[PDB]
């Protein structure tokens, strides 16, 4: 189980630079729930 975690770790460690910040804030405005955190996947 740990292995997928490590792969996703490597992935997340390189998607911290290719993210936007303005849109990040403007997202953080809206509230998230169970329905929009894993049901739009």
């Amino acid at each position: 189980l740990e292995r997928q975690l490590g792969e996703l770790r490597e992935e997340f460690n390189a998607l911290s630079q290719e993210i936007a910040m303005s849109q990040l804030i403007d997202l953080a405005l809206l509230p998230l729930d169970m329905f929009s955190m894993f049901s739009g996947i």
Binding site: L8, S16, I25, L27
Partner: protein, 186 residues
């Protein structure tokens, strides 16, 4: 109790001594984001947004494994956390980082710090999740214009001033925000 009237927010249950005092205070204040006593854009907000975009765009995610990902994200994001409190033109700030500041609302010309009014004001009054740290506030004062309106807004961590600052390419706030991002590393 570090201050007066022990309030279950200052015990020692869990650099000089004051730093450690405020640090054991700050790791506790981290959970004030868990109990609905904030007035701005909390840290866990930034954490949640990073989690959102990252778990959406990625390719190795799977419904098999979303659990324990959400958990580790919840309990390792943002290792360096700050907090500030307001009282009558007089604000103070503490964080686990290993520092502590105090200064005045009119002009951000630092005031030497006290740790006994501090604990009282925090444990009762509304706590605002710092999102722009003191380095950044002082600098933004220096090289960029400042309005007392703008200042009330920033100390409030207002959305408008934040986003407008982002859109104006103002580099220091961008660098602070990117530092926050690069903190969310799992």
């Amino acid at each position: 109790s570090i201050g007066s009237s022990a309030s279950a927010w200052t015990d020692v249950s869990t650099v000089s001594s004051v730093s450690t005092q405020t640090s054991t205070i700050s790791r506790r204040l981290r959970l004030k984001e868990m109990a609905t006593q904030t007035e701005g854009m909390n840290f866990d907000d930034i954490s949640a947004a990073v989690l959102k975009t990252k778990i959406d765009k990625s390719t190795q995610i799977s419904p098999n494994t979303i659990p324990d990902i959400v958990t580790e994200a919840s309990e390792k994001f943002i290792p360096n956390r700050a907090y500030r409190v307001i009282n009558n033109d007089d604000v103070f700030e503490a964080g686990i980082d290993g520092k502590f500041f105090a200064y005045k609302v009119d002009t951000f010309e630092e005031i030497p710090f006290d740790v006994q009014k501090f604990a009282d004001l925090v444990t009762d009054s509304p706590v605002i999740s710092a999102i722009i740290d003191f380095k950044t506030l002082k600098n933004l004062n220096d090289n960029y214009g400042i309005s007392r309106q703008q200042a009330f807004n920033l100390l409030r961590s207002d959305p408008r001033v934040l986003r407008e600052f982002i859109n104006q390419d103002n580099p220091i706030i961008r660098n602070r925000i990117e530092q926050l991002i690069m903190q969310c590393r799992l």
